[PDB]
Amino acid sequence: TTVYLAGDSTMAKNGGGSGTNGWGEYLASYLSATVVNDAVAGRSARSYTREGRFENIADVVTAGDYVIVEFGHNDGGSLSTDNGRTDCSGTGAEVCYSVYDGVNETILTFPAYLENAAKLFTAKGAKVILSSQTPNNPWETGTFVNSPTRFVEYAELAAEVAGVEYVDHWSYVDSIYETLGNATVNSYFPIDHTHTSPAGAEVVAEAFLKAVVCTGTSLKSVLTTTSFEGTCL
Ligand SMILES: *[C@@H]1O[C@H](CO)[C@@H](O[C@@H]2O[C@H](CO)[C@@H](O[C@@H]3O[C@H](CO[C@H]4O[C@H](CO[C@H]5O[C@H](CO)[C@@H](O)[C@H](O)[C@@H]5O)[C@@H](O)[C@H](O[C@H]5O[C@H](CO)[C@@H](O)[C@H](O)[C@@H]5O)[C@@H]4O)[C@@H](O)[C@H](O)[C@@H]3O)[C@H](O)[C@H]2NC(C)=O)[C@H](O)[C@H]1NC(C)=O
Ligand SMILES: *[C@@H]1O[C@H](CO)[C@@H](O)[C@H](O)[C@H]1NC(C)=O
């Protein structure tokens, strides 16, 4: 069994640079399955699709494998000053066009990209798990601020429409960060409010696994332990 990870710098090996790391790097210790971390810094659901990264996972994935998809951090912004990452606004079949990198590109909504990827993987027999993006430092101002992005609910909607599993990674990380306190969570963010240090990546990875056990996600079957702090929800 192989577990494929598709995500951004919050998940990728080497994180966002300068000593940060991604949470996908701390998953393998807890699974009896091979983990292939295909997350890449700077990618959104759009650019990951455009660069052929979802397609490449589709090529090697086999029946019984898992694919965990988690995007959102790089998905916002404005299409007027197109950075190649911003998705089209909307929750459904809406379509946008923008000239980026010498191509009049057809741009889909965030949910559309995730649904399309899930359909490719599911048709081959892989188990797909859409996961909401991790939160940016909620203690940044000294007090706890709980503010999810639209991509948190969008991921849930995508899982509903595609008929796959959903893991609310956002809530589980924000819940544990709230209990950790100001001084500790701030120490997890060395250079900005997004990229986690190795300790913060470990906490983020454990929170994903806490979400899996609490919700009963299929991945539970290759989980080596359920000993993680926090509570369900
Ligand atoms: C939530 O937790 C926070 C982190 O644990 C905590 O904030 C810390 O509080 C301690 C205790 O009071 C402070 O320690 C004291 O720091 C001063 C020197 O402070 C100044 O210099 C530091 C370091 O500057 C350099 O490094 C940083 C990071 O690499 C660079 O950004 C920077 O360019 C320099 O190279 C700097 O972090 C401090 O910044 C804070 O203060 C200013 C206003 O005063 C703000 O503009 C800024 O947003 C930030 O709040 C500051 O410029 C030293 O002289 C003392 O001896 C003592 O060591 C920490 O500085 C402080 N750290 C931070 C990031 O704030 C909070 O108290 C807590 N929140 C609440 C509400 O309780
Ligand atoms: C891109 O293609 C769409 C139709 O597919 C068209 O309506 C739009 O004008 C094109 N954009 C540019 C800049 O040519």
Residue 1 corresponds to which tokens in the numbers above? 């069994």
Distance CA(189)–CA(137), nearest Å, equals 7
The answer to whether 71 and 131 are in contact (CB under 8 A) is: no
Whether 97 is in the pocket of ligand 2, judged by its Cβ within 6 Å, is: yes
What separation in Å is there between the alpha carbon of 136 and the centre of ligand 1? 19
Query: What is the DSSP pairing of strand 103-107 with strand 96-100?
Result: antiparallel
Q: Angle at Cα 68 formed by Cα 233 and Cα 151, nearest 5°?
A: 60
Header resolution in angstroms: 1.9
> 193 catalytic, yes or no?
no
**Active-site residue, 9 included:** yes
How long, in residues, is the chain? 233
* Integer Cα distance of 99 and 61 in angstroms: 32
Q: Is the CB of 183 under 6 A from ligand 1?
A: yes
Q: How far apart are alpha carbons 174 and 185 in whole angstroms? A: 10
Two tokens, residue 80: 């007027």
Nearest to 191 by CA among 11, 12, 15, 37: 15
In angstroms, the Cα distances linking 108 to 49, 61, 98 are: 10, 24, 11
Q: Which amino acid makes up residue 12?
A: A
Q: Is 186 in the pocket of ligand 1 (CB under 6 A)?
A: yes
Asked if 82 is an active-site residue, the reply is no
Question: β-pairing, 165-167 with 96-100?
Answer: unpaired
Ligand 2: centre distance to CA 97 (Å): 6
With b for 16 or more beta-carbon neighbours within 10 A and e for fewer, the 211-225 pattern comes to bbbbbebebeeeeee
**What domains are there in the chain, each with its CATH number?**
1-233 (3.40.50.1110)
Q: Which residue from 95, 97, 100, 106 has its CB within 8 A of the most atoms of ligand 2, so it is best to mutate?
A: 97
> Which experiment gave this structure?
X-ray
The sign of the dihedral angle between the CA atoms of 212, 213, 217, 223 is positive
- Sequential DSSP letters for 53-88: HHHHHHHH--TT-EEEEE--TTS-S-GGG--S-PPB
What's the rounded Cα separation, in Å, for the pair 47 and 98? 13
Query: For residues 118 and 151, what is the distance between their CA atoms, to the nearest angstrom?
Result: 16
**What is the C-alpha to C-alpha distance for residues 79 and 51, in angstroms, rounded to an integer?**
18
- For ligand 1, whether the C-beta of 102 sits within 6 Å is no
